[PDB]
């Protein structure tokens, strides 16, 4: 199967970690 | 793709006579000429006049027997005679056929200054050589 | 080709047909019986059964031919052979008794030896071995091209070809130089033979 849901989760987590690091 | 005088197959149901079925490269191979006259032989003359006469005769006969003709004419020339052999459907009453025969013979004889005979062969329906 | 594939090439060799039946092998007997039933092509106008016919010379003449002028090519070939023979005869008469043994006067032997000397054993890029037919064709084409070179002015083809053939018969001349250059280039590019 494709990993579109996994990719979306990964992008969300990456954005969240970036936001945490920023602030 | 060659398109001259060919009947392209469409569905396998359209009927065609023997002449319509055969392509131009079959002339003198599987089908003879529809007009026989000494014009096109070696050294002979007046080919153009005979061709014009044949074209006019075909048009006149097609327009004189509306829907009666079941196939192309055959224009034979012997000396100054001119025999138009036609295959006609059995639609009209024979009175109209005889009237048209007399009319066309007299009119063509007076128009081309040659004794024109018209021989009709009747068929119940258009002869079907095959279906395309 | 107007010949059907059933047709076979003719075999023009009188010794082959005059060979006794006893010497024929069973396989050769079967070959003859098969040929008794095979359609054979007409003999070409080029080759005959003449004892003087030389297939090498015929091929050389055909290669020399320009625009189907077989008459002129054959004339050039026979003139070249005559020139080689006359030059060799002059050398023979001008030489001492000891040298007369070494001097060769057969134009056909001289021609064959010259072409054999001009044949390149190696060819090309990656150097590669050359088959026999390619070797002979290369030798003939090199000879003809060199003789056709504009470097020789107003000299007729028979004289130039005779001079080059005599040079080749002595392992000299620009044709042998071209063969040596090809050999040296192949030796240099030997490092690329892994390709």
């Amino acid at each position: 199967k494709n990993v579109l849901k996994i990719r979306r989760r990964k992008m969300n987590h990456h954005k969240y970690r970036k936001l945490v690091k920023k602030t | 793709k060659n398109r001259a005088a060919r009947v392209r197959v469409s569905k396998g149901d359209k009927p065609v006579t023997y002449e319509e079925a055969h392509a131009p490269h079959y002339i003198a191979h599987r089908k003879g000429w529809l007009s026989l006259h000494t014009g096109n032989l070696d050294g002979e003359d007046h080919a153009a006049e005979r061709t014009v006469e044949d074209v006019f005769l075909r048009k006149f006969m097609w327009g004189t027997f509306p829907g009666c003709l079941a196939d192309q004419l055959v224009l034979k020339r012997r000396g100054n005679q001119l025999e138009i052999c036609a295959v006609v459907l059995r639609q009209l009453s024979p009175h109209k056929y005889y009237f048209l025969v007399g009319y066309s013979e007299t009119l063509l004889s007076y128009f081309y200054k040659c004794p024109v005979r018209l021989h009709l062969q009747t068929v119940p329906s258009k002869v079907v050589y095959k279906y395309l | 080709s107007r010949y059907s594939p059933e047709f076979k090439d003719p075999l023009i060799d009188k010794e082959y047909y005059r060979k006794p039946v006893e010497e024929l092998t069973e396989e050769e007997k079967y070959v003859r019986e098969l040929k008794k039933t095979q359609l054979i092509k007409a003999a070409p106008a080029g080759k005959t059964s003449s004892v003087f016919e030389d297939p090498v010379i015929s091929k050389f003449t055909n290669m020399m031919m320009i625009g189907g002028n077989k008459v002129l090519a054959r004339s050039l070939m026979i003139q070249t052979l005559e020139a080689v023979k006359r030059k060799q005869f002059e050398k023979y008469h001008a030489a001492s008794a000891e040298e007369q043994a070494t001097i060769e006067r057969n134009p056909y032997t001289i021609f064959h030896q010259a072409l054999k000397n001009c044949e390149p054993m190696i060819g090309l890029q990656v150097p590669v071995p050359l088959p026999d037919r390619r070797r002979r064709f290369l030798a003939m084409k090199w000879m003809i091209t060199e003789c056709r070179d504009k470097k020789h002015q107003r000299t007729l083809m028979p004289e130039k070809l005779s001079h080059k053939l005599l040079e080749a018969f002595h392992n000299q001349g620009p044709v042998i130089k071209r063969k040596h250059d090809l050999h040296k280039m192949a030796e240099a590019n030997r490092a690329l033979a892994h390709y």
Partner: protein, 150 residues
Amino acid sequence: HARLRALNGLLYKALTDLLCTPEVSQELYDLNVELSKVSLTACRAYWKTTAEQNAHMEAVLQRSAAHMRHLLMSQLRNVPPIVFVQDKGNAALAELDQLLAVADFGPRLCGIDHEALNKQIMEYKRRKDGRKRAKPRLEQDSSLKSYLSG
């Protein structure tokens, strides 16, 4: 295809076993020939090459090919003839070097066509001097309307 691959592998294994055992031939056993590849179409065998010993190995293999085929027929009984190919790395290199030893040597930018564009510019100087796409599944059909009409 996979069946032919397995057949090639089986032929390789059988030929290796025949090579290794001494019962086939004392000569072949002493040679200790090793096969690089075996491929069936006739069968082509490729063995690694070590010149004189290479020639001897090739000659012995050619001599014993018939016996090897006969022994293989005992096993896979319908075995096509086996062709041994000597793998001198690139055999062309070996043959070329052999001939070269034999042979005789006698006595010892911008990526564009700027010129064409310049010519075109000079020629010019001299002469001077989206929309909607309906979905396929939403296209209307009026055949049913015609059928219901009559």
